[PDB]
Amino acid sequence: KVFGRCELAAAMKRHGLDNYRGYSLGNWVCAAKFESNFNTQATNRNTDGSTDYGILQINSRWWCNDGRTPGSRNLCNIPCSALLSSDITASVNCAKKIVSDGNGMNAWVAWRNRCKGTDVQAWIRGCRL
Ligand SMILES: [Cl-]
Ligand SMILES: [Cl-]
Ligand SMILES: [Cl-]
Ligand SMILES: [Cl-]
Ligand code: NA
Numbered sequence: 001k002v003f004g005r006c007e008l009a010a011a012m013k014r015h016g017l018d019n020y021r022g023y024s025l026g027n028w029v030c031a032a033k034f035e036s037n038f039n040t041q042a043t044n045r046n047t048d049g050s051t052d053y054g055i056l057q058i059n060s061r062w063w064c065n066d067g068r069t070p071g072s073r074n075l076c077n078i079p080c081s082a083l084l085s086s087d088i089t090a091s092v093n094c095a096k097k098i099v100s101d102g103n104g105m106n107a108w109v110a111w112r113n114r115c116k117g118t119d120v121q122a123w124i125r126g127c128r129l
Contacts, residue, residue: 042055043084064078
């Protein structure tokens with residue numbers, strides 16, 4: 001599924017991301033825009049051993065199981081396929097695990113390099129959630 005900006009913002013709000021661990025909603029919408037272009041089936045297979053899955057491009061090295069890499073971990077305790085669903089709930093649950101693990105939204109490269117420090121509130125402009 002390819003989401004629109006406000007459509008995804010609504011779903012993320014429903015799943016409780018607005019202000020989660022200090023990150024107002026626009027942070028999460030901006031991260032998804034640059035990570036996946038809002039596409040739930042985005043998948044990128046990297047030379048560094050990461051396969052990144054779904055709307056938040058979550059990494060198989062640590063967070064989900066796809067079977068391919070026996071030295072990896074599965075800390076969200078999910079198949080990576082769960083991150084490719086049309087509903088965002090597994091992606092949001094695993095994102096929440098990543099951030100609350102003594103960490104932040106620095107876990108998304110595109111957040112650090114495209115969203116941090118910007119007017120992230122504007123990703124919810126015209127959404128009237
Ligand atoms: Cl957009
Ligand atoms: Cl907090
Ligand atoms: Cl990671
Ligand atoms: Cl694996
Ligand atoms: Na894994």
